[PDB]
Amino acid sequence: ADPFESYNPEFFLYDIFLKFCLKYIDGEICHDLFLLLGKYNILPYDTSNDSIYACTNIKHLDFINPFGVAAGFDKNGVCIDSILKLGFSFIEIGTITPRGQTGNAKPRIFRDVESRSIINSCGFNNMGCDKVTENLILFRKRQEEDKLLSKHIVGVSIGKNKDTVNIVDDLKYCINKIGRYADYIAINVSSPNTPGLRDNQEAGKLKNIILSVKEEIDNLEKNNDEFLWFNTTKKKPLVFVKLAPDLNQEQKKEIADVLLETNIDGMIISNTTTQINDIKSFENKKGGVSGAKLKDISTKFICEMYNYTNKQIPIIASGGIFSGLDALEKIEAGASVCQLYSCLVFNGMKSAVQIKRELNHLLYQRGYYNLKEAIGRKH
Amino acid sequence: ADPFESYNPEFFLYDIFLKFCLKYIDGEICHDLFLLLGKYNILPYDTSNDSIYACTNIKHLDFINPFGVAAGFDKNGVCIDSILKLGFSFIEIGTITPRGQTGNAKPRIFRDVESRSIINSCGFNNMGCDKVTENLILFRKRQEEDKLLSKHIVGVSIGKNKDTVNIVDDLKYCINKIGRYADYIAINVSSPNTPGLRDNQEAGKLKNIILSVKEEIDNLFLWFNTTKKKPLVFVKLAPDLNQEQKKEIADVLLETNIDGMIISNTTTQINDIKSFENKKGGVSGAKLKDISTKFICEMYNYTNKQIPIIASGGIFSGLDALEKIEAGASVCQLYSCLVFNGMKSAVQIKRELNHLLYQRGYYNLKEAIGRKH
Ligand SMILES: Cc1cc2nc3c(=O)[nH]c(=O)nc-3n(C[C@H](O)[C@H](O)[C@H](O)COP(=O)(O)O)c2cc1C
Ligand SMILES: Cc1cc2nc3c(=O)[nH]c(=O)nc-3n(C[C@H](O)[C@H](O)[C@H](O)COP(=O)(O)O)c2cc1C
Ligand SMILES: Cc1nnc2c3sccc3nc(N3Cc4ccccc4[C@@H](C)C3)n12
Ligand SMILES: Cc1nnc2c3sccc3nc(N3Cc4ccccc4[C@@H](C)C3)n12
Ligand SMILES: Cc1nnc2c3sccc3nc(N3Cc4ccccc4[C@@H](C)C3)n12
Ligand SMILES: Cc1nnc2c3sccc3nc(N3Cc4ccccc4[C@@H](C)C3)n12
Ligand SMILES: O=C(O)c1cc(=O)[nH]c(=O)[nH]1
Ligand SMILES: O=C(O)c1cc(=O)[nH]c(=O)[nH]1
Numbered sequence: 001a002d003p004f005e006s007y008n009p010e011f012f013l014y015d016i017f018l019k020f021c022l023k024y025i026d027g028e029i030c031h032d033l034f035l036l037l038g039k040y041n042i043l044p045y046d047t048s049n050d051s052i053y054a055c056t057n058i059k060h061l062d063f064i065n066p067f068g069v070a071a072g073f074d075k076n077g078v079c080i081d082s083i084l085k086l087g088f089s090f091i092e093i094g095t096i097t098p099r100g101q102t103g104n105a106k107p108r109i110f111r112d113v114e115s116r117s118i119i120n121s122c123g124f125n126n127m128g129c130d131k132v133t134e135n136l137i138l139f140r141k142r143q144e145e146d147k148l149l150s151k152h153i154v155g156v157s158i159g160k161n162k163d164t165v166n167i168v169d170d171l172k173y174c175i176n177k178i179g180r181y182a183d184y185i186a187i188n189v190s191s192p193n194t195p196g197l198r199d200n201q202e203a204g205k206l207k208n209i210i211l212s213v214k215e216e217i218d219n220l221e222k223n224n225d226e227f228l229w230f231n232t233t234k235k236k237p238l239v240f241v242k243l244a245p246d247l248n249q250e251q252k253k254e255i256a257d258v259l260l261e262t263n264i265d266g267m268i269i270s271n272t273t274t275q276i277n278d279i280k281s282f283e284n285k286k287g288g289v290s291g292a293k294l295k296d297i298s299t300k301f302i303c304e305m306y307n308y309t310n311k312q313i314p315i316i317a318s319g320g321i322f323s324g325l326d327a328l329e330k331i332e333a334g335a336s337v338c339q340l341y342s343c344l345v346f347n348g349m350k351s352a353v354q355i356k357r358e359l360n361h362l363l364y365q366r367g368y369y370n371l372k373e374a375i376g377r378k379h
Numbered sequence: 380a381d382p383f384e385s386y387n388p389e390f391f392l393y394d395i396f397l398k399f400c401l402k403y404i405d406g407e408i409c410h411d412l413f414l415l416l417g418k419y420n421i422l423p424y425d426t427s428n429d430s431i432y433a434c435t436n437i438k439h440l441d442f443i444n445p446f447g448v449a450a451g452f453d454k455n456g457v458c459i460d461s462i463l464k465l466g467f468s469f470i471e472i473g474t475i476t477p478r479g480q481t482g483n484a485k486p487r488i489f490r491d492v493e494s495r496s497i498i499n500s501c502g503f504n505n506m507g508c509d510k511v512t513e514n515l516i517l518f519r520k521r522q523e524e525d526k527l528l529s530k531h532i533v534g535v536s537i538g539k540n541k542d543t544v545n546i547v548d549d550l551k552y553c554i555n556k557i558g559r560y561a562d563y564i565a566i567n568v569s570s571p572n573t574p575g576l577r578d579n580q581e582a583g584k585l586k587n588i589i590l591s592v593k594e595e596i597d598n599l600f601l602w603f604n605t606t607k608k609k610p611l612v613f614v615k616l617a618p619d620l621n622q623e624q625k626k627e628i629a630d631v632l633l634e635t636n637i638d639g640m641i642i643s644n645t646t647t648q649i650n651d652i653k654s655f656e657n658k659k660g661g662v663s664g665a666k667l668k669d670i671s672t673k674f675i676c677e678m679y680n681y682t683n684k685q686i687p688i689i690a691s692g693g694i695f696s697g698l699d700a701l702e703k704i705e706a707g708a709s710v711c712q713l714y715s716c717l718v719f720n721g722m723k724s725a726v727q728i729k730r731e732l733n734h735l736l737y738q739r740g741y742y743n744l745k746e747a748i749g750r751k752h
Contacts, residue, residue, distance in 0.1 A: 003382050006421070013419055020415060029403050036399060040392060042380060 009044040009086060009349040018348035027109035027118075027345075031073075038079025044349050046087035051360050053370040056336050058266050058314040060233060061183060063337055064151050065089040066327065066359070066371055067352055070318050070339040071157040071186060071242070072120075076127045077135040081142060084152050087352025092339070093132065094157030095188045098173040100128030101161060104193060112281045116322065116346050117294075119279075120272070121287030123193040124159055132156075133178045140181055140230050153232055157186035157242065160197065167200060168212045175216040176223075181230050182237040187213055190244035190271030192288040198244050203254040206241070210262040213239055238265035240316065245270040245297050249304070256308035268316045268339070269305055270298045291342035295320025299333050306334030306376055322347060324358025331371065332378035388423040388465060388722040397721040406488035406497070406718075410452075417458025425466035425726050433733055433744045435710050437639050437687045440562060440611055442710055443530050444468040445700070445732070445744060446725055449691045449712040450536040450565060450615070454505045456514040460521065463531050466725025471712070472511065473536030474567045477552045479507030480541060483572065491654045495695065495719050496667070498652070499645070500660030502572045503538055512557040519560050519603050532605055536565035536615070537592075541573060546584075547591040554595050560603050561610040566592055569615035569644030571661040577617045582627040589614065589635040611638035613689060618643040618667070618674050625674075629681035641689040641712070642678055643671040664715035668693025672706055679707030679749060695720060697731025704744065705751035 005011050021030040037043045050065040057063060068090035069083055077093035084091055103125025110119050126132065136154065143149050158174040160167040171187065179185060187209060189200040200206055217236050221228060229235055241264060243255065259267060272288025275297070282289065298319025306315060317335035321327055322343045330338050343351045359371075368374045384390045400409040416422045429444045436442060447469035448462055456472040463470060482504030489498050505511065515533065522528050535557055539549040554564065566588065568580040579585065592612055602608055614637055616628065632640060645661030648670070652662070671692025679688060690708035694700055695716045703711055716724045732744075741747045 013421065017415070024408050025404060033399070040395065042392070
């Protein structure tokens with residue numbers, strides 16, 4: 001790769017520019033710059049063939065590798081192709097809302113490189129469900145003819161507009177608009193930047209929310225020369241819920257009962273935390289903290305929810321995953337698949353290539369024939 | 380997407396990223412970002428050969444084409460090769476001083492895209508003559524082994540440290556270090572951002588300064604540059620002088636036997652840019668063009684066409700250039716055109732000027748110098 005050197009995610013120039021943007025350019029602008037490269041398909045891409053021993057699954061959802069991009073990175077779904085070709089097996093676009101939303105005031109993203117941490121208070125900035133659907137549709141039809149993308153998974157994370165009273169109405173609008181094109185739906189009741197939306201994790205309220213979302217998905221069949229499931233699975237999307245790590249033991253057991261009763265297909269553990277207060281540069285800043293100081297939080301949350309749901313609900317891990325050994329901790333804690341965010345910010349384009357390679361060697365060194373043999377083995 | 384488009388200065392992606400940085404990223408940061416691409420040789424380049432119909436000269440100094448990069452763009456000379464390969468025939472590094480300086484407080488560069496103007500107050504930030512010299516020597520030694528750069532020109536613009544009393548000593552210190560590697564030296568009495576240094580072009584002092592520089596330069600293969608000859612001596616003038624001061628300075632550069640004059644530096648007389656309300660410094664760009672151009676016609680007249688002119692100020696299009704040349708300039712210098720027009724500026728402006736000279740009946744570019752006149 002002499003001419004192709006510019007498209008290798010590990011090409012040394014990419015971290016020179018990464019270290020520059022981390023040091024000089026506002027975080028949200030660096031994010032927008034990244035999406036601009038993706039939008040015109042001049043992001044580097046991963047040529048590795050993924051190890052068949054490291055694929056994983058949540059029911060009929062078949063991931064070619066265990067790493068995807070967490071929600072909030074391509075909120076509007078404007079360069080799905082490009083980000084996936086970095087080496088990821090799925091992406092969760094969103095969170096989207098019915099009507100487009102400005103978000104909270106700027107700046108709303110701040111970083112601490114020494115500790116590999118992010119704080120943010122974006123407040124569900126997104127273009128709206130109508131526009132994001134059109135973006136996803138255009139990816140789906142490019143997928144119609146592209147063999148390298150035909151097995152990649154796309155989830156959609158849905159939430160409420162800031163000035164909306166009952167969240168069920170807003171989730172319903174999004175499922176009827178975008179549900180037919182998603183391989184799974186993420187219900188976002190975790191976020192800390194929308195006033196009083198983490199109160200929807202009370203067992204009573206969360207139960208009604210899940211049942212509504214399921215009801216609306218099953219009603220899309222008996223509600224209309226067109227393929228109903230315009231996605232990868234070709235089945236109705238699975239329903240996940242993304243949980244906030246700031247709950248006590250009792251709330252966790254109550255939520256576990258609901259996710260068993262309602263027959264949810266998975267849980268995303270976890271969103272950002274408000275409980276970190278030992279980052280000096282985040283002194284006067286507001287919002288939820290992600291990244292390396294979240295890993296131990298998120299992982300112990302995985303073990304409890306794996307235990308409280310009797311290993312019945314598959315887990316998507318999120319929180320402080322940078323290395324292959326970070327990933328193995330999540331998997332051994334109960335997670336079937338992992339989600340990177342702060343790893344892209346601080347490690348850059350190479351994040352999928354590096355972590356897949358590291359985890360492959362780790363699984364062999366620990367004696368696991370494949371990845372599914374490792375799930376929940378620390379228990 | 381493929382390399383044969385990513386290294387083309389006219390590839391449309393360069394305007395998408397230009398438009399983005401213009402509206403979202405601090406001006407000095409975009410400049411630093413640009414220099415980073417140059418440092419690692421991932422700027423686009425113009426591989427086309429330049430028409431001999433548009434070559435020019437300042438006495439024995441032969442430019443393959445009439446377009447160069449003004450001072451203050453590669454102050455420290457860290458990607459000379461890369462910038463030249465955009466299509467330019469010379470660049471003027473600097474302005475450098477003996478000892479390095481941070482410069483003034485940040486931010487010190489501001490843009491107004493609508494009017495294509497820049498205001499700045501850097502205050503001669505540079506690494507110092509010692510470090511910059513080392514960078515130029517290494518360009519010269521790579522020039523020794525690349526034929527594609529062997530006819531390109533590199534000037535050096537010289538100034539004084541902010542806290543310095545005798546300017547002659549500091550200009551002398553720079554030539555004794557860097558003069559052997561320069562095709563020409565630019566004496567900076569132009570700038571408005573060094574306290575009371577645009578007042579050092581009073582006829583009394585300015586004469587002693589020029590004689591100082593020439594005396595020190597002549598006291599030095601000796602010449603490791605393109606000329607392979609002693610560097611020629613230029614002066615860059617500030618456009619904010621009255622009629623009386625302009626005729627006096629013209630007398631000196633005739634007496635002192637100067638080789639050329641750079642017209643012009645930035646102006647402080649523009650006050651109708653709404654976005655520059657509370658900002659301080661000198662204004663560049665499109666609103667300086669008419670000013671700098673009339674400055675050329677006066678200086679060409681007061682010097683009886685005896686001293687060639689390097690044009691600088693508000694040059695974006697081929698017809699902007701033809702105005703300068705027809706006014707008395709033998710060569711042109713771009714700054715604000717790179718900021719607002721991006722990687723394509725040398726490619727585009729050369730093509731436009733070539734077509735213009737033909738449409739106007741000019742046998743070559745030198746037939747046009749001072750013809751409006
Ligand atoms: C700037 C920013 C925006 C985010 N936006 C969303 C979002 O819209 N929906 C969501 O479910 N999570 C969002 N998240 C949380 C991430 O998806 C992820 O769960 C969290 O950052 C922890 O993972 P990490 O430590 O690997 O980055 C956001 C995080 C950040 C830093
Ligand atoms: C940010 C900035 C820094 C500059 N620094 C210098 C400098 O160090 N020395 C100098 O002679 N001119 C300097 N200039 C002036 C340019 O060389 C040029 O004369 C001026 O910008 C007018 O040309 P333009 O209209 O094409 O921009 C600087 C200009 C800008 C905008
Ligand atoms: C890496 C890399 N490798 N080759 C290239 C080439 S080739 C022509 C342009 C070009 N730009 C880059 N970047 C410059 C840049 C600037 C600002 C923010 C991010 C980046 C990264 C994405 C890549 N390149
Ligand atoms: C840097 C940086 N700082 N904040 C962020 C955020 S915030 C949400 C996403 C996001 N992405 C990044 N980049 C990852 C990356 C990788 C390689 C080269 C350049 C870059 C930058 C320009 C963008 N970010
Ligand atoms: C143009 C162009 N053509 N190919 C590429 C490629 S290929 C890999 C990276 C890459 N980056 C760019 N730019 C991205 C970018 C980002 C921020 C500021 C300026 C720029 C410009 C210089 C070029 N590219
Ligand atoms: C933008 C911008 N804004 N201020 C400046 C300044 S100030 C002194 C030099 C300078 N160079 C530029 N660029 C020209 C250019 C061309 C093509 C793609 C990107 C860019 C940017 C990143 C840098 N600048
Ligand atoms: O958009 C946001 O502000 C946001 C949403 C979310 O779910 N998590 C987060 O950290 N921020
Ligand atoms: O470096 C500067 O501040 C500067 C120098 C100069 O000559 N002209 C200008 O506008 N700024």
